[PDB]
């Protein structure tokens, strides 16, 4: 439990912090359940994309004086989805086709990684509240209320003894 001095004023303050903590734990897991929904549709799409482009890019690589000809044509936007920012000669012909195909593969695979990173930040946010913050308070409140009662219980006890004097 977090170190604290037992007082009636501290009891009510820790009582209000736990109620806000319990609701905040509810909301961050809702964000955890939500992220799991938009990640899952995007991830399955990426998995199918990645598999298709992978094999297709290799077969392009598979089909691929040659040094002198390659000597001498030189040719990401920030979008916020939810709480996460998201970025936006036959073998030669296959290369140019794949080059657009790889840019969309880059601005999609990197998007899923940013979803997984924010998923992990929220996940550990949620986990700490359930395993540390809220339990530390729950045990703290127990000790606080314990002390106050026996203290007033032992305080009125001596007052009965002083009354006999």
């Amino acid at each position: 439990r977090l170190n604290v001095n037992p007082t009636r004023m501290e009891l009510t303050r820790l009582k209000k912090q736990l109620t806000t903590a319990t609701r905040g734990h509810k909301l961050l897991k809702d964000k955890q359940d939500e992220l799991m929904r938009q990640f899952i549709l995007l991830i399955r799409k990426n998995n199918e994309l990645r598999q298709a482009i992978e094999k297709e890019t290799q077969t392009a690589m598979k089909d691929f004086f040659i040094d002198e000809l390659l000597a001498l044509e030189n040719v990401v936007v920030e979008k916020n989805i939810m709480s996460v920012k998201v970025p936006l000669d036959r073998s030669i012909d296959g290369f140019t086709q794949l080059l657009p195909k790889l840019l969309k593969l880059a601005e999609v695979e990197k998007t899923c990684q940013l979803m997984a990173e924010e998923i992990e930040k929220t996940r550990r946010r949620v986990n700490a509240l359930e395993y540390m913050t809220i339990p530390q308070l729950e045990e703290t409140i127990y000790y606080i209320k314990m002390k106050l009662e026996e203290n007033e219980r032992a305080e009125v006890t001596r007052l009965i003894k002083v009354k006999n004097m």
Partner: peptide, 11 residues
């Protein structure tokens, strides 16, 4: 600060 101690300020 009281709503952000435990939740964190990242959001």
């Amino acid at each position: 600060n009281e709503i952000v101690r435990l939740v964190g300020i990242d959001s």
